[PDB]
């Protein structure tokens, strides 16, 4: 029982780590998409709003 | 003789109604122009502007 406690708990560690980096990957994804969004909408609204007018 | 009176009044109210339509279409056509030039299309924007005017 005790050595199993060690083994499992170790798996918990490493799997948790990958879980963290995947988390970062997803949130990064959201930020990227949304940012693309603002760059575009702002761009097509920068074409008819171009500074001279 | 009445027949001609009635046709004249009819033609008058006719012209008024058609004028009314063309005007309504005019406003709708302004809107449609704005949607058009929103993309950046300089051709559709043209013939729409034109139809609005006419």
User: A-B interface: how many C-beta pairs under 8 angstroms?
Assistant: 5
Closest CA to B33 of B54, B21, B50, B16: B50
Alpha helices, DSSP H, located in chain B: 2-39, 44-53
CA distances from A29 to A16, A23, A39 (A): 20, 10, 15
Contact residues for B36 (Cβ-Cβ < 8 A; gap 6+): B44, B45, B48
Give the minimum alpha-carbon distance from B53 to chain A in angstroms, rounded to a whole number.
23
Q: State the structure-solving technique.
A: cryo-EM
Alpha-carbon gap, residue B34 to A32, rounded angstroms: 31
Residues of B in contact with A47 (CB under 8 A): 40
Q: Return the structure tokens found at B22.
A: 């063309």
- Core vs surface per residue B1-33: b (16+ CB within 10 A) or e: eeeeeeeeeeeeeeeeeeeeeeeeeeeebeebb
Evaluate whether B43 touches B31 at the Cβ level (below 8 Å).
no
Resolution to 1 decimal place, in Å = 4.0
């Amino acid at each position: 029982q005790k050595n199993q406690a060690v083994n499992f708990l170790r798996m918990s560690a490493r799997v948790d780590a990958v879980a963290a980096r995947v988390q970062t990957a997803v949130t990064m994804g959201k930020v990227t998409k949304s940012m693309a969004g603002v760059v575009k909408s702002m761009d097509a609204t920068l074409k008819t709003m171009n500074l001279e007018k | 003789m009445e027949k001609h009176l009635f046709n004249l009044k009819f033609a008058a109210k006719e012209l008024s109604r058609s004028a009314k339509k063309c005007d309504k279409e005019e406003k709708a056509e302004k809107a449609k122009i704005e949607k058009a030039i929103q993309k950046g299309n300089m051709e559709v924007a043209r013939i729409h502007a034109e139809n609005a005017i006419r």
